[PDB]
Amino acid sequence: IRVFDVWKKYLWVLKGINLEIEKGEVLGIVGPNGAGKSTLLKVITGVTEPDKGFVERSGKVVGLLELGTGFNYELSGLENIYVNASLLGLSRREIDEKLESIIEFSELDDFINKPLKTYSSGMIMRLAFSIAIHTEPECFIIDEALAVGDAHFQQKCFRKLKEHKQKGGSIIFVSHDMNAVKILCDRAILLHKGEIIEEGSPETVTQAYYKLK
Amino acid sequence: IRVFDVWKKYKYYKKPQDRLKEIIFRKPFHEELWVLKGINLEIEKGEVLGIVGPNGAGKSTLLKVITGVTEPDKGFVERSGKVVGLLELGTGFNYELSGLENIYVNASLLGLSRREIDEKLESIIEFSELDDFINKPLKTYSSGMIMRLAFSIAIHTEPECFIIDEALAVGDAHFQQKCFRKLKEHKQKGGSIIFVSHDMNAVKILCDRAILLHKGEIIEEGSPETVTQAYYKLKLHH
Numbered sequence: 001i002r003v004f005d006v007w008k009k010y011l012w013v014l015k016g017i018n019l020e021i022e023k024g025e026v027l028g029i030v031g032p033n034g035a036g037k038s039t040l041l042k043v044i045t046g047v048t049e050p051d052k053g054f055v056e057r058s059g060k061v062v063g064l065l066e067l068g069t070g071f072n073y074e075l076s077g078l079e080n081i082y083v084n085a086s087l088l089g090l091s092r093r094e095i096d097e098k099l100e101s102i103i104e105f106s107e108l109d110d111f112i113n114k115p116l117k118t119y120s121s122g123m124i125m126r127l128a129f130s131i132a133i134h135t136e137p138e139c140f141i142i143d144e145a146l147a148v149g150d151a152h153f154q155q156k157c158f159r160k161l162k163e164h165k166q167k168g169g170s171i172i173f174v175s176h177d178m179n180a181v182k183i184l185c186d187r188a189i190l191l192h193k194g195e196i197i198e199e200g201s202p203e204t205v206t207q208a209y210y211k212l213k
Numbered sequence: 214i215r216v217f218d219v220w221k222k223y224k225y226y227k228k229p230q231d232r233l234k235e236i237i238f239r240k241p242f243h244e245e246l247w248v249l250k251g252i253n254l255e256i257e258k259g260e261v262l263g264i265v266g267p268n269g270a271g272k273s274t275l276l277k278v279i280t281g282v283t284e285p286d287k288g289f290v291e292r293s294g295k296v297v298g299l300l301e302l303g304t305g306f307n308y309e310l311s312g313l314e315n316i317y318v319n320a321s322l323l324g325l326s327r328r329e330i331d332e333k334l335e336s337i338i339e340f341s342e343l344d345d346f347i348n349k350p351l352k353t354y355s356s357g358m359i360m361r362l363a364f365s366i367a368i369h370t371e372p373e374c375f376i377i378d379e380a381l382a383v384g385d386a387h388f389q390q391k392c393f394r395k396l397k398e399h400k401q402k403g404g405s406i407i408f409v410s411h412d413m414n415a416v417k418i419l420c421d422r423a424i425l426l427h428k429g430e431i432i433e434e435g436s437p438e439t440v441t442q443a444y445y446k447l448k449l450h451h
Binding site: 010013033034036037038039042048064065076078079110111113114115117118119120121122123125143145148149151176 | 223224225226227228229246248268269271272273274277283299345346349350352353354355356357358360378379380381383384385411
């Protein structure tokens with residue numbers, strides 16, 4: 001939710017970053033690839049510790065880095081659901097309530113017992129999406145590379161995202177399509193060399209990015 | 214390159230519980246299923262071959278035997294040179310290491326020599342378009358930059374065949390074209406490419422010929438029109 005004066009070095013990747021993601025919000029993060037967007041998201045999700053300052057988050061954040069974490073291909077898809085969902089914080093009771101819905105979402109009911117090694121690359125993405133979309137995290141990190149291979153599958157993923165937004169979820173959108181930002185994002189921010197140059201409505205930020213572009 | 218009488222099986226426990234019960238009773242309590250049955254195939258240098266089929270047909274397990282990650286239970290596969298696939302892309306990367314340092318381990322694992330790395334090192338870093346960040350460690354790299362780097366190392370190792378699933382290579386179209394241009398250069402240089410997709414239109418235009426894989430066997434093979442037609446005939450009678 002809230003990022004307060006967070007700093008990260010290795011040179012400082014992030015300098016004086018203050019940010020807040022409110023509930024029910026679709027937030028777009030735009031900038032050069034070299035600006036350090038990945039390091040900013042990692043401090044948010046919590047995989048990277050801020051060198052100076054702090055960030056407080058109400059709940060877990062799910063991003064591409066988390067997606068499909070801990071998968072073991074020797075294990076079955078059904079077995080893999082448990083290990084992935086457990087790493088994402090779902091309780092044993094929660095998994096069983098959602099195991100039925102997760103399998104129906106992936107549409108792998110025929111193949112779910114089969115071990116992951118046999119699955120096609122598309123099937124694995126479909127499975128990891130199903131586990132991730134159901135963990136009910138407070139925030140979702142959506143890079144444009146996500147949602148690839150959607151035989152209308154994106155619509156089911158997109159429909160749950162509307163449900164997630166209505167339930168107080170927050171979404172972070174990482175993409176280079178500014179037009180997409182206006183359509184999906186309630187507000188956006190532009191990141192340059194570890195600092196936020198301009199923030200606000202997606203129209204204002206899209207203008208500023210074009211000024212930089 | 215050449216796949217002869219390849220067969221591949223796996224254990225199929227009905228319930229996760231049953232994996233326990235087989236420990237207790239000392240008896241197997243699994244199901245043996247064959248991903249690939251009677252797979253005979255040839256890949257000619259300078260060929261774009263399309264592998265189309267249902268997800269269960271076994272394409273992933275078949276591609277994995279070709280790349281060399283999995284050994285066939287029955288039959289054999291012979292390849293003249295290395296094959297690069299999604300599992301290989303960025304294999305062995307350590308994010309704590311620098312982007313330049315990580316290049317060395319990937320190429321060393323992909324078989325490139327210390328001398329071989331250096332000759333093409335200039336173009337590869339210029340190919341990735343990562344200039345100041347090359348000194349920087351991978352952890353700072355964006356997901357795009359990491360994938361962008363991994364493609365760059367793999368695309369120039371000049372393996373005999375490239376396996377391209379359609380979901381793979383997604384990204385900046387301008388960089389995807391850079392990969393597309395190099396693959397055309399790869400084909401001209403005697404390279405062979407394998408195209409895996411559910412887009413028949415993509416298969417028909419790009420693939421010189423194709424095979425249809427269903428239930429672990431090739432039901433129809435040949436010109437892309439016939440195979441794409443055959444794939445439609447298969448979808449009717451299911």
